[PDB]
């Protein structure tokens, strides 16, 4: 057997960031200034996104190394937060639309936007950690689902196959191809196993802003005409459900859970379209 349905815990105090680490403009505001930015980035922007992406990838891998039964999701946030701040990066989620922590930690039936807190990870859990770094005036965004202890076969396979769906979609990225191929490839692969790809959350353009108005769907919709062009930067980040897509949001206003409490998994990279293919910006 795996654990029972989760419930919310208590948050630790807000974690401080030294003042010399520049804040994104939305910290201390209720909304963000984003959604109308260009989709192709300039070379200077891309070079700063490589640095933000590598720092985000390091924070994700250090917090993912700590996933084990007995560890709290708050402890993963401490690790991610400190890694970012020691690298002179601001954690982009902290204060984004009022989100209270430096990463999102989404176990088991939590689709996304789980809030690090007193929740204890236990054997059989799958733990998505999602971290974004703002440094050099740009963002870098990555997430991965990590197993805790011995995970049941149905949940292990969901994680491995989500990871594979994400990588197969990244390996389609090429100038001249339709953006819609990413969702065609993810949903065709998911559907081989009878999984359902979440539709109401998507990937996005990213650059000087977190969510720049470019939308990357992870389901099949070939009517989108957007073409991948050199210098475009965006995420591929499918959330894949064992059960139905219906979902609810907890009273905290953030945590998104499957209504049937069946488990879900997600992986994410920030990508650059190159002249030949793709470059993953969120690698170690
Ligand atoms: O794009 C992401 O990878 C992501 C993870 C969390 C969020 C997010 C979206 C909307 C409101 C707040 C938050 Cl933290 O966005
Ligand atoms: O373990 C690996 O080698 C592997 C393949 C894909 C990923 C991964 C890591 C971080 C975020 C996204 C993805 Cl797809 O990690
Ligand atoms: Mn993310
Ligand atoms: Mn993202």
Swiss-Prot record:
Keyword terms, alphabetized: Aminopeptidase, Hydrolase, Metal-binding, Protease
Highest taxon of the lineage: Bacteria
Binding site for substrate: 113, 211
Annotated SUPFAM superfamilies: Creatinase/aminopeptidase
Cofactor or coenzyme needed: Co(2+); Zn(2+); Mn(2+); Fe(2+)
Gene Ontology CC: cytosol
Protease as UniProt keyword: yes
Keyword presence, Transit peptide: no
UniProt cofactor note: Binds 2 divalent metal cations per subunit. Has a high-affinity and a low affinity metal-binding site. The true nature of the physiological cofactor is under debate. The enzyme is active with cobalt, zinc, manganese or divalent iron ions. Most likely, methionine aminopeptidases function as mononuclear Fe(2+)-metalloproteases under physiological conditions, and the catalytically relevant metal-binding site has been assigned to the histidine-containing high-affinity site.
EC code: 3.4.11.18
Catalytic activity: Release of N-terminal amino acids, preferentially methionine, from peptides and arylamides
Residues where a divalent metal cation 1 binds: 130, 141, 268
A molecular-function term among this protein's GO annotations: metalloaminopeptidase activity
BP terms from Gene Ontology: proteolysis
Subunit structure: Monomer.
HAMAP family: MetAP_1
Function: Removes the N-terminal methionine from nascent proteins. The N-terminal methionine is often cleaved when the second residue in the primary sequence is small and uncharged (Met-Ala-, Cys, Gly, Pro, Ser, Thr, or Val). Requires deformylation of the N(alpha)-formylated initiator methionine before it can be hydrolyzed.
Entry's family note: Belongs to the peptidase M24A family. Methionine aminopeptidase type 1 subfamily.
Name assigned to this protein: Methionine aminopeptidase 2
